[PDB]
Design a protein around this ligand. Sequence first.
Ligand SMILES: NC(=O)c1ccc[n+]([C@@H]2O[C@H](COP(=O)([O-])OP(=O)(O)OC[C@H]3O[C@@H](n4cnc5c(N)ncnc54)[C@H](OP(=O)(O)O)[C@@H]3O)[C@@H](O)[C@H]2O)c1
Ligand SMILES: Nc1nc(=O)c2nc(CNc3ccc(C(=O)N[C@@H](CCC(=O)O)C(=O)O)cc3)cnc2[nH]1
Ligand SMILES: [Mn+2]
Ligand SMILES: [Mn+2]
Ligand SMILES: [Mn+2]
Length: 159
Amino acid sequence: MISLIAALAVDRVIGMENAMPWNLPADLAWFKRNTLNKPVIMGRHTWESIGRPLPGRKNIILSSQPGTDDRVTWVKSVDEAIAACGDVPEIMVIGGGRVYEQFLPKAQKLYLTHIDAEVEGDTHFPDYEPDDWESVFSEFHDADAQNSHSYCFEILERR
Ligand SMILES: NC(=O)c1ccc[n+]([C@@H]2O[C@H](COP(=O)([O-])OP(=O)(O)OC[C@H]3O[C@@H](n4cnc5c(N)ncnc54)[C@H](OP(=O)(O)O)[C@@H]3O)[C@@H](O)[C@H]2O)c1
Ligand SMILES: Nc1nc(=O)c2nc(CNc3ccc(C(=O)N[C@@H](CCC(=O)O)C(=O)O)cc3)cnc2[nH]1
Ligand SMILES: [Mn+2]
Ligand SMILES: [Mn+2]
Ligand SMILES: [Mn+2]
């Protein structure tokens, strides 16, 4: 099973200038809980944005060019990325925009955080078709001293 996890600001913005400009510790904690002990697939730009391997996860990087760091696994195609994960119950695709586009048709589950923030951005989450997806979990949180925007954790499963 392939799942996508992402945090979306208004208008599906996910990034600007190879960064995420907001800071929502509660959402990073949610990201860690839902990805720990699973393989994570990311594109090369997202690897450069994170800047280090994510501990406790098999890190698989998509790039058309040879890898430059043996602490992670480098692959050259979507099919190779999937194969490099082995026989696991759940593969997590962690972006960015161009990677999410390619894996969306193959995904059974989306873990989405909707952030009440307006962000100028240059990268968006793919338009998906709402009729294809059932919301099975949602949890709203107001802003607090640690998280400066309200946010909504949602899990959707392909119908
Ligand atoms: N809010 C969130 O949830 C979230 C999550 C992740 C990322 N982001 C943001 O998203 C932005 C980065 O997204 P992006 O769309 O620019 O880039 P990306 O999807 O992270 O990376 C694109 C790169 O991945 C490689 N790639 C993708 N598909 C491939 C394929 N089929 N075969 C081989 N290589 C492939 C290519 O690398 P080469 O050029 O080396 O061939 C391509 O240039 C940043 O702003 C980041 O902060 C946000
Ligand atoms: N919901 C969601 N939020 C995100 O921030 C997110 N980020 C990415 C890609 N970028 C990043 C950037 C930083 C870290 C990071 O530092 N993660 C630590 C945080 C642990 C914690 O704060 O509790 C990790 O171990 O996962 C992960 C992914 C992909 N999907 C996402 N999905
Ligand atoms: Mn092929
Ligand atoms: Mn197999
Ligand atoms: Mn806000």
